[PDB]
Design an enzyme around this catalytic site. Structure first.
Site, PDB file in Angstrom:
ATOM      1  CB  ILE A   1      -6.230 -54.028  24.259  1.00  0.00           C
ATOM      2  CG1 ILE A   1      -4.808 -54.065  24.816  1.00  0.00           C
ATOM      3  CG2 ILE A   1      -6.373 -52.882  23.279  1.00  0.00           C
ATOM      4  CD1 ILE A   1      -4.420 -52.803  25.556  1.00  0.00           C
TER       5      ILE A   1
ATOM      6  NE  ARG B   1     -16.280 -64.700   6.832  1.00  0.00           N
ATOM      7  CZ  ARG B   1     -16.754 -65.151   7.993  1.00  0.00           C
ATOM      8  NH1 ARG B   1     -17.044 -64.306   8.971  1.00  0.00           N
ATOM      9  NH2 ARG B   1     -16.918 -66.452   8.183  1.00  0.00           N
TER      10      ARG B   1
ATOM     11  CB  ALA C   1     -17.302 -71.714   9.996  1.00  0.00           C
TER      12      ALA C   1
ATOM     13  CD  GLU D   1     -22.354 -70.775  13.506  1.00  0.00           C
ATOM     14  OE1 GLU D   1     -22.915 -70.364  12.470  1.00  0.00           O
ATOM     15  OE2 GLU D   1     -22.182 -70.052  14.515  1.00  0.00           O
TER      16      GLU D   1
ATOM     17  CD  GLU E   1     -22.728 -69.577   9.030  1.00  0.00           C
ATOM     18  OE1 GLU E   1     -22.178 -68.676   9.684  1.00  0.00           O
ATOM     19  OE2 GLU E   1     -22.118 -70.271   8.195  1.00  0.00           O
TER      20      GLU E   1
ATOM     21  N   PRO F   1      -1.479 -68.460  14.574  1.00  0.00           N
ATOM     22  CG  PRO F   1       0.209 -70.041  14.371  1.00  0.00           C
ATOM     23  CD  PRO F   1      -1.042 -69.562  13.696  1.00  0.00           C
TER      24      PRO F   1
ATOM     25  CD  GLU G   1     -30.086 -59.208  13.902  1.00  0.00           C
ATOM     26  OE1 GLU G   1     -29.582 -59.850  14.851  1.00  0.00           O
ATOM     27  OE2 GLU G   1     -31.047 -59.640  13.222  1.00  0.00           O
TER      28      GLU G   1
ATOM     29  CD  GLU H   1     -23.639 -64.679  11.336  1.00  0.00           C
ATOM     30  OE1 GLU H   1     -22.997 -65.215  12.272  1.00  0.00           O
ATOM     31  OE2 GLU H   1     -24.572 -65.256  10.734  1.00  0.00           O
TER      32      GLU H   1
END
Lengths: 182, 182
Positions: free
Chosen positions: A12, A62, A74, A90, A94, A112, A137, A139
């Site tokens: 998809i 987020r 992360a 990371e 970060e 899950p 870019e 983030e």
């Protein structure tokens, strides 16, 4: 020995992320369509603790939630890369940090029912900032430093909304207490 | 006061689940496409504990991971329904149980990078089986009963792979110790 049989698997989306819509025959013999993020796929999470008993964290936007959340560094584990390597990468990207020992904590599935992704948590010891962060870019985040006592006070007060970060802190707690950092 | 501006929001899927592909202008002025499960959406998770200090759990097939996982009863919160109500409904549907007090635990985002969903955990006291479970087509699970000591041994050994279940257990622990059930 899967309980469900694949009838047809349709892709998809390939990017931003890969999503599939699978037609399967269930345990009842009836057909069902299941949409999910297939695996194998993984991400690493790392709680970086300094020798002074502070943690190097990030406050990151987020988009789906419209909030900036307090999280441990992360990111997705790259093809051919180990969970621990992604963790160290990371941490550097970060928070511009490096660390010594990385204690692997129990792996877990964030959701899950929708994604095959496995998250691999780690506790990084003697974390130290050695370079400027390298944010990509897309983030939007900033690194911060908090005493572990404050981090765990927030955890206990239920103020750590990101599940992975909360779980990473819960699994790291006995190690931090054992090592005298908490 | 969102850092990113919506250019266009396309619905990529409405069911099984709703997915969107959003074109936005980021904090750098550049464009980015973000695919996510939009909100507001939620699910409840409930750890049902009996008066004998055992827990009513489920072993459920989670297709994306190809595994049967040990989980606390859970499910999406229906339109117009409260998190606590969904918790009591899923407890009844999946484990055929009812409970007395439900202590709300800290809410959390399972994967904020991809979905707006908020999970609401609860600790249900004096849980008891009063009817046969009511499983729907598409769901493959069985209920079981385990002493809390064994449940927490598994948690500490890192054998609880479902993140929500693990987090629910970590947040419930002090309450169980306080109430003398653990």
């Amino acid at each position: 020995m899967s309980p469900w049989e694949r009838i047809l698997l349709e892709e998809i989306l390939s990017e931003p992320v890969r999503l599939v819509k699978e037609r399967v025959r269930t345990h009842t013999g009836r057909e069902l369509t299941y949409v999910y993020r297939p695996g194998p796929v993984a991400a690493s999470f790392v709680l970086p603790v300094t020798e002074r008993g502070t943690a190097l964290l990030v406050r990151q936007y987020r988009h789906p939630t419209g909030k900036f959340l307090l999280e441990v560094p992360a990111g997705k584990v790259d093809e051919g890369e180990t969970p621990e390597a992604a963790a160290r990468r990371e941490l550097r990207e970060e928070v511009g940090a490096e660390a010594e020992t990385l204690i692997p904590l129990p792996s877990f599935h964030p959701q899950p029912s929708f994604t095959a992704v496995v998250f691999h948590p780690f506790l990084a010891l003697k974390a130290r900032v050695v370079t400027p962060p390298t944010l990509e870019e897309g983030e939007l985040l900033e690194s911060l430093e908090l005493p572990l006592t404050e981090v765990y006070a927030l955890l206990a007060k239920g103020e750590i909304q990101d599940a992975s970060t909360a779980l990473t802190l819960f699994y790291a707690e006995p190690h931090l207490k054992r090592l005298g950092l908490l």
